[PDB]
Amino acid sequence: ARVADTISSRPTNSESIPALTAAETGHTSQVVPSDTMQTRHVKNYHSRSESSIENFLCRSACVYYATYTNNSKKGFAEWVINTRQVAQLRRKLELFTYLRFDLELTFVITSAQQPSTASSVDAPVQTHQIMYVPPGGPVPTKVKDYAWQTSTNPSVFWTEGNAPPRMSIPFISIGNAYSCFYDGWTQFSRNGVYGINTLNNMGTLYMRHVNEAGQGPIKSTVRIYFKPKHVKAWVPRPPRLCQYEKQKNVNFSPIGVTTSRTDIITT
Amino acid sequence: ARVADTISSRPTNSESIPALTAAETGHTSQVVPSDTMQTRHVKNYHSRSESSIENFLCRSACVYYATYTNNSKKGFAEWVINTRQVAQLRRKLELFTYLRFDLELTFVITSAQQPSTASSVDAPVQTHQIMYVPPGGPVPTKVKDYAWQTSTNPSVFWTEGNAPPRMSIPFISIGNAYSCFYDGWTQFSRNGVYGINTLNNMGTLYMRHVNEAGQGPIKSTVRIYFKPKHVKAWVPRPPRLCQYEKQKNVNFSPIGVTTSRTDIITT
Amino acid sequence: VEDEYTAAGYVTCWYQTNIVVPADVQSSCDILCFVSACNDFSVRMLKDTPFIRQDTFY
Amino acid sequence: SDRVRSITLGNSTITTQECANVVVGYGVWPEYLKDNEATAEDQPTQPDVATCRFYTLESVQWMKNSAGWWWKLPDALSQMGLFGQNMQYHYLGRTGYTIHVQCNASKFHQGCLLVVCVPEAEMGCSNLNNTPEFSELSGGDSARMFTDTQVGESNAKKVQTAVWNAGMGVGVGNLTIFPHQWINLRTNNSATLVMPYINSVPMDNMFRHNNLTLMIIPFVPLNYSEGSSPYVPITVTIAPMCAEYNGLRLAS
Amino acid sequence: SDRVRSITLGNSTITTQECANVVVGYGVWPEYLKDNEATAEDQPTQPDVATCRFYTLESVQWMKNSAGWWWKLPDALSQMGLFGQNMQYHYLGRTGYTIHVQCNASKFHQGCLLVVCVPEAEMGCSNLNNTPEFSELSGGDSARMFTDTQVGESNAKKVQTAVWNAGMGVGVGNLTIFPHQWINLRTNNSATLVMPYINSVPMDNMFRHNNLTLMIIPFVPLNYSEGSSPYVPITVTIAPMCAEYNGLRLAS
Amino acid sequence: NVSSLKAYQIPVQSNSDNGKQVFGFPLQPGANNVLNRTLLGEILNYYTHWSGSIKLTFM
Amino acid sequence: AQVSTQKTGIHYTNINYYKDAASNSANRQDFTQDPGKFTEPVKDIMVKTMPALN
Amino acid sequence: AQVSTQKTGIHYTNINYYKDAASNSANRQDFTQDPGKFTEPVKDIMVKTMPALN
Ligand SMILES: CCCCCCCCCCCCCCCC(=O)O
Numbered sequence A, B: 001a002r003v004a005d006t007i008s009s010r011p012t013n014s015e016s017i018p019a020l021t022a023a024e025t026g027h028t029s030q031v032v033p034s035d036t037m038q039t040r041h042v043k044n045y046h047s048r049s050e051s052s053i054e055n056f057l058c059r060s061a062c063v064y065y066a067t068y069t070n071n072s073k074k075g076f077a078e079w080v081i082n083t084r085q086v087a088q089l090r091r092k093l094e095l096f097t098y099l100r101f102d103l104e105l106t107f108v109i110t111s112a113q114q115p116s117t118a119s120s121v122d123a124p125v126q127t128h129q130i131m132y133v134p135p136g137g138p139v140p141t142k143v144k145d146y147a148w149q150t151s152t153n154p155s156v157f158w159t160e161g162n163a164p165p166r167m168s169i170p171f172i173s174i175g176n177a178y179s180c181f182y183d184g185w186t187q188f189s190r191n192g193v194y195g196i197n198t199l200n201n202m203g204t205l206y207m208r209h210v211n212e213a214g215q216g217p218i219k220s221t222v223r224i225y226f227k228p229k230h231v232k233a234w235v236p237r238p239p240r241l242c243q244y245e246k247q248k249n250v251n252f253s254p255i256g257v258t259t260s261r262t263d264i265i266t267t
Numbered sequence C: 001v002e003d004e005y006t007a008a009g010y011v012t013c014w015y016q017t018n019i020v021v022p023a024d025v026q027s028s029c030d031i032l033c034f035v036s037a038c039n040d041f042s043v044r045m046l047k048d049t050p051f052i053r054q055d056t057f058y
Numbered sequence D, E: 001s002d003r004v005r006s007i008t009l010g011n012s013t014i015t016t017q018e019c020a021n022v023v024v025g026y027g028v029w030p031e032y033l034k035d036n037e038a039t040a041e042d043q044p045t046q047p048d049v050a051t052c053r054f055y056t057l058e059s060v061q062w063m064k065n066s067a068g069w070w071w072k073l074p075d076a077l078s079q080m081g082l083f084g085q086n087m088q089y090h091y092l093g094r095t096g097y098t099i100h101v102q103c104n105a106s107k108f109h110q111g112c113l114l115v116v117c118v119p120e121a122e123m124g125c126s127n128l129n130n131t132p133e134f135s136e137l138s139g140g141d142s143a144r145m146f147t148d149t150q151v152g153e154s155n156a157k158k159v160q161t162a163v164w165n166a167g168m169g170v171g172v173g174n175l176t177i178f179p180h181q182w183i184n185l186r187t188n189n190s191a192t193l194v195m196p197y198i199n200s201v202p203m204d205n206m207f208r209h210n211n212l213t214l215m216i217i218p219f220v221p222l223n224y225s226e227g228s229s230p231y232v233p234i235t236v237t238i239a240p241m242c243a244e245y246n247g248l249r250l251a252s
Numbered sequence F: 001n002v003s004s005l006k007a008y009q010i011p012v013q014s015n016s017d018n019g020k021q022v023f024g025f026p027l028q029p030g031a032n033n034v035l036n037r038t039l040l041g042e043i044l045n046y047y048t049h050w051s052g053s054i055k056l057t058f059m
Numbered sequence G, H: 001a002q003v004s005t006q007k008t009g010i011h012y013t014n015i016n017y018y019k020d021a022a023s024n025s026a027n028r029q030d031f032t033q034d035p036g037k038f039t040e041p042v043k044d045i046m047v048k049t050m051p052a053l054n
């Protein structure tokens, strides 16, 4: 993807006006710097390969982290899948209005020892289970539940001390693209929920320890990473100026357009 | 496996009656919606690939879990192989009358530390043995037994902290297909056992620790997962309405066909 | 699952004319209803069913 | 001479003697739905002369301390002729648009306007917990206006209408990434934008979803001297293009 | 078996298991206006699925002392869907019709009905000096009924509704010169008539002129024995065919 | 009528008026309790998305 | 080595390593339909436009 | 096996192992540009040397 090269030029005295235009037409001028001054011939070998949509968006970014305790009544974690609780991936995806990609999912699981009271605490290797429930299915209510039978829901098992678990997800949607912005309601009477919460229905993700609480409590933490593959994008958008405040909507507090200086001629 | 597409149509005034039929023949009508109203031409690209018998049944499902303790007289586990102690795989397999598949077997083994009384408890890595005895062979009676010599019975060994063990099983049967339902007895005098227990003879599965009880008791738990491959199916069946009560038979308590509403015109 | 963004509508039934019956015939009749799918029906994204329970092994 | 146009749609005509070029969307002209992209399988309705014509909204006054105005686009035409009657009896629909903003003044006045068209312009609220209710987000062919101040948090359901944030939390100078034109009273008299149908679905309901927003923001304020005309109006004219509908039912 | 039909128009369907033939006008099927007969020179509107469909009027009870009913045809469909909305915004229009009258009873009932369609059925008044006012000549999809008696001259603006004169001063037995069918409860269950556009001009205004009239007259009265069902309804279903309009203006 | 065979029968009489309603239900083939438990509505409860036409036969 | 077609909305390679046919992978790409044995199990064929009983 | 060109400032080999097209690697080498739909979205074309308004 090489860039255009420079063409040599000569002194002119003519009727053609490249520098004069009209910006009132909504049309950006197509002048090169070899029209306003004398240039030399320069062969450019630079490429635009690092600014593609396939290269700008295909990196792993953290979206959530949750904790769950071993020695606890109903100690397990849940998360409703969205991309609006972090500030860095939300600003990158909201440069466009419609997106369409595959996904790559990676989990990072740690553990920590809690202040127990017994002597000679020695625990074996821990095993974790991460379950995905599509919308409409049965959900777990506790740790020893029948809902963890995973007969048709996809799940994964992992033992501590190995490579992190990874899997792929295709373009799961009902429409033809994902929508970052929705200007409308969910009811036909125009009441209630207004915004992007009317389109978010992706499921819930559950996490638990498979072992038993032997002689000491253990507190674990999972971290989730998103990586879009095979990306298409439509209708670009200005970047966000103000800071994000909530998750469901786009409410903000107003702020200035830039920072200030002391004069108009200050360099 | 693309679905059929829509054909355009015109206003009619004729003798042909697609909407009128007779459901008394036991014959489902073959009308498309381009016979009862005016349609446009629509090319459908949808596929029926996710509803095949190879895609509906080829997922891993938990069938049993058992425990066994290290510091115990006769501490080991046994299980007679069947698919009728869980509620989610039993309802999926009983949509058909006859089935024929290969198998894939996966085990998930954990451990836990029991409240010992000694100081400086530190145990090495644990090793487990899982043995399969076909019907008629010798069975173990204790942990230090001669029956664990596994000269011709297939067994597996596994050290804690690795990938889970996995193996394949072919279509082992005496008939031409597995039978989910059997309407008959085992005696010619029509006494005694009635039902599916007359056809179940698959063997027993044994589990033990190979290490010795060093200085502290350890309680382990295995979990078993089934995955049918190369599936054929015959004679479909209505799904089960009531809740399962036992394992050997199909006894139930009666329940209503649906849940109720307050009127026939309630939307 | 129930979702107001992807609703499908309503199915009703009304009397066009009356049920006219002779003498010595019962007036009250009955209607049965059936349901099925056409040849463009398809499904996606296999999950679990909410129509079964368990507490302990059978 | 590029300075003259003439647009003819149905039984209506626009004539202009002082104009810039015509901006066409993202390079795409409006068109009917094809057989490869269709999902609703019954025959659509195309009236095509009774709906595809120029409808004129109300007029607003450009004052000196004026901040801006906006319109939600498949909502101002909800009581206009036979276009607003097909929306009530049908469930689906898709439309392209042609917008013509027009404002004239003499050679002794000055000022500049930005006329953009924003797809999916979701707006925010002044109270940080709620969302704005329907009466503030749009009106029936009547402009909702921005203000140069900041709406306080003591109100519950009101739009945050600070102009430099454009209601959406972004910079107002970066709104030129959308298809737009300028009206400069030194040289220009009108602006014309042609927009195709933009959505993530091939058809949509036109009463629960506004998929376009037309904003008019004065960057350079209106100025004149003593004796010149103080009243300067702005008028907007919208024409639907290649509209079709599906799903007949009761009147809603 | 000639006894079954199926008519499909838009998103609606009629099915019949006991029927006579279909009567087609004067041998002519409805069609659009040609280029040789046109006089209005702007482009017409043809919605063609939103208007050309089956609309069902109200139901009337066939009693024993029952005399007849009538409907004025481009007036009962004046509040029906998108057909009655195009009539309010346009000035001209032309339409053909499809009428389906339907009445069922058992094998133990008897009676006969005549279903005719009369073009330009101008009616008379009971007072010999005046003409009947609008409220008696037609109703909004509600039947106006004849009576077996004679309306007195003491009333001022009322229709003379004696059945044997058919409201027009002619013999009621000679109404079979118009396109018609019979409903005989011994053999028949419905009647279907297809009517083209009949006028002396190629287009006409549909609010000042009714160019068709549908009459249903019981020649043999309804009779049954004790125990049979006493309530017998009659239902009418009309579908416009090949409708087009001209002259957009305000809503009237 | 749910613990009976009367749940499948739709009552039909001879009236003294016109235009009465027989039944009515919303079209939700996997969430509405009318079409929930049928042969079509049990296969749909194993999946999440569905698409296509639906036949309704009356006898 | 088998080269197959890799379901989309491009190819892949597959080699078998074991001696028994029960050790292979799942089929997952056998799309075959015969709905007529359940929906029309009648003796004489029925045309849609004709009546059912004559 | 696909043989591609391995971006420099030499080839490499790529084989697909899974049955679904969502399991492949990223594209990373699809360089295509069309800036004219954003920078010049006008009806009549504008030559650079000519004036904008005549
Ligand atoms: C163990 C398997 C886990 C399966 C996880 C599947 C998660 C689904 C991913 C949904 C992508 C969400 C994209 C953003 C949605 C939107 O912007 O509207």
Ligand SMILES: CCCCCCCCCCCCCCCC(=O)O
Binding pocket: B081, B082, B083, B103, B105, B130, B131, B132, B154, B155, B156, B167, B169, B178, B179, B180, B199, B200, B202
């Ligand atoms: C370590 C090797 C273990 C070998 C395990 C072999 C288990 C045999 C599997 C039998 C399949 C049972 C299928 C259901 C039987 C039925 O429904 O009647």
